[PDB]
Amino acid sequence: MVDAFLGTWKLVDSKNFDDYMKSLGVGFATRQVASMTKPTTIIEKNGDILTLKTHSTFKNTEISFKLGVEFDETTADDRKVKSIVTLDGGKLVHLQKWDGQETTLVRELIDGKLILTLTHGTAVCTRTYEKEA
Numbered sequence: 168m169v170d171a172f173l174g175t176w177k178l179v180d181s182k183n184f185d186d187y188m189k190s191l192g193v194g195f196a197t198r199q200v201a202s203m204t205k206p207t208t209i210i211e212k213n214g215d216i217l218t219l220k221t222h223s224t225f226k227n228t229e230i231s232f233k234l235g236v237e238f239d240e241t242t243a244d245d246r247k248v249k250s251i252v253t254l255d256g257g258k259l260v261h262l263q264k265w266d267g268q269e270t271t272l273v274r275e276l277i278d279g280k281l282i283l284t285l286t287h288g289t290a291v292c293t294r295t296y297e298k299e300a
């Protein structure tokens with residue numbers, strides 16, 4: 168039920184990403200570079216398995232997961248977390264848990280754009296991605 172999320176997406180707007188990174192303890196030099204990076208996110212499916220790639224000039228990540236099945240993840244900032252991704256209200260909700268901490272990465276399609284909302288602590292970042300042909 169994931170299908171309009173699938174494809175290649177490019178970052179076209181970012182709000183409060185520094186706040187989000189700082190909440191997670193990312194160092195200032197990394198936050199500089201990340202504030203000027205525009206990743207490409209690729210979301211593909213094969214049966215029940217999704218693969219989500221995030222590519223940039225700085226750092227790259229890739230995860231594969233089944234919806235609703237927990238997986239181990241090592242994040243771009245090197246947190247070792249327990250993750251689960253589900254559909255909720257048509258949104259792709261990714262929850263990461265580590266050391267009793269929790270962050271959510273929520274993706275929603277609005278007017279054909281993919282809106283990624285990142286929440287940790289009180290920090291709320293909104294990143295907008297537009298689809299590549």
Ligand SMILES: CCCCCCCCC(=O)O
Pocket residue numbers: 178187188191193206208221242243244283294
């Ligand atoms: C500081 C942790 C950053 C983790 C990944 C954030 C993802 C951002 C993105 O995909 O646009």
Ligand SMILES: CCCCCCCCC(=O)O
Pocket residue numbers: 188193197201204206221222223225226227228243244245
């Ligand atoms: C996977 C590309 C993400 C680029 C921006 C965020 C990097 C954050 C970090 O390294 O701590």
